[PDB]
Structures are given as structure tokens and as C-alpha cells.
Amino acid sequence: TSWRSEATFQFTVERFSRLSESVLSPPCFVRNLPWKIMVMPRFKSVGFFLQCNAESDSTSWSCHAQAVLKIINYRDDEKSFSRRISHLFFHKENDWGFSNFMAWSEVTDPEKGFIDDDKVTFEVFVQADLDAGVSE
């Protein structure tokens, strides 16, 4: 259900080499809030952020999350590149991630295993509000 406490979801960006703007993945619900992967070029590195409830018109929400942002390596998963984040998402800071997740030249290098048919796959494993739960 949308009330699950954790989830893993991927977002593939096609024609990556041509990417000239910021793109958003469709939503993945965790603890009933919409989480999305945000990717964009940064001045060259790949910007990779996790967004939560960005379209809410209320300031009365929060999500204490721990997540792993990863760019998958089709050839050898052991070679996929990951970075962890920990953040209390709320209206003033509803996305969190790395403006310099990886060098653009390193991710687009066809001999590195992060791009196939000009496609790069981003993945996020997110756990929300695990500090909250039933008393027993």
C-alpha cells in the first residue's frame, strides 16, 4: 500500500547525453507521500536529488528519511555508484541530494557501464519515519 515504510524505485533517463534540463520521475508513495527522483546537469556533473511532497499546499507535514541514491551499472552491480542521505523533509527543504553526484564525463563514458543506448538508470531506496511505529 501507499502506507509502506520503505521502497526502492528506479527512473531511467533516455537520450541522457542530450539532457539539457531538469527532469522528474513519476511519484513513488511511501508513508502516503509522493517521492520523486530529480536529475539535471550542473555546472559538468550530474545532479541527483530525492524530492518529497513538493506539490503540497500545506506546511504541516514532514518525513524523516534515510535513503540511498544510486546510479546503476548494468555490467556489474557491484560497480553501481551509491551515496547515502539522511534528512527531515519538510516544506522549506522538500528535496535533498547531490549537485555533484558524479562527473558528467564519468557517467556518459560508454566504457564505464553507467550508460547504455544513451540511457542512465537512477535508483532510490528510501525509508521514511522508522523512528515512529507501534508501541509493541
Numbering used by the authors: 63 to 105, 113 to 205
Paper quotes:
Herpesvirus-associated ubiquitin-specific protease (HAUSP, also known as USP7), a deubiquitylating enzyme of the ubiquitin-specific processing protease family, specifically deubiquitylates both p53 and MDM2, hence playing an important yet enigmatic role in the p53–MDM2 pathway. Here we demonstrate that both p53 and MDM2 specifically recognize the N-terminal tumor necrosis factor–receptor associated factor (TRAF)–like domain of HAUSP in a mutually exclusive manner. The crystal structures of the HAUSP TRAF-like domain in complex with p53 and MDM2 peptides, determined at 2.3-Å and 1.7-Å resolutions, respectively, reveal that the MDM2 peptide recognizes the same surface groove in HAUSP as that recognized by p53 but mediates more extensive interactions. Structure-based sequence alignment of the three HAUSP-binding peptides revealed a conserved four-residue binding motif with the consensus sequence of (Ø/E)-G-(Ø/G)-S, where Ø denotes a non-polar residue.
After many unsuccessful trials, we once again succeeded by engineering a chimeric protein with the MDM2 peptide (residues 223–232) fused to the C-terminus of the HAUSP TRAF-like domain (residues 53–197). We crystallized this chimeric protein and solved its structure at 1.7-Å resolution. In the structure of the HAUSP–MDM2 fusion protein, the MDM2 peptide (residues 223–230) is bound to the shallow surface groove on one side of the β-sandwich in the TRAF-like domain, the same site where p53 binds. The MDM2 peptide assumes an extended main-chain conformation, extending across strands β3, β4, β6, and β7. Five residues in the MDM2 peptide, Asp225-Ala226-Gly227-Val228-Ser229, make extensive polar and non-polar interactions with the surface-binding residues from all four strands, particularly strand β7. At the N-terminal end of the MDM2 peptide, the carboxylate side chain of Asp225 accepts a charge-stabilized hydrogen bond from the guanidinium group of Arg152 in HAUSP. The side chain of Ala226 in MDM2 packs against a hydrophobic pocket formed by the backbone Cα atom of Gly166 and the side chains of Phe167, Trp165, and Ile154 in HAUSP. The main-chain groups of Gly227 in MDM2 make two hydrogen bonds to Gly166 in HAUSP, whereas the backbone Cα atom of Gly227 is within van der Waals–contact distance of the hydrophobic side chain of Trp165 in HAUSP. At the C-terminal end of the MDM2 peptide, Ser229 in MDM2 makes a total of three hydrogen bonds to surface residues in HAUSP. Compared to p53, the more extensive interactions between MDM2 and HAUSP provide a mechanistic explanation to our biochemical observation that MDM2 out-competed excess p53 for binding to HAUSP.
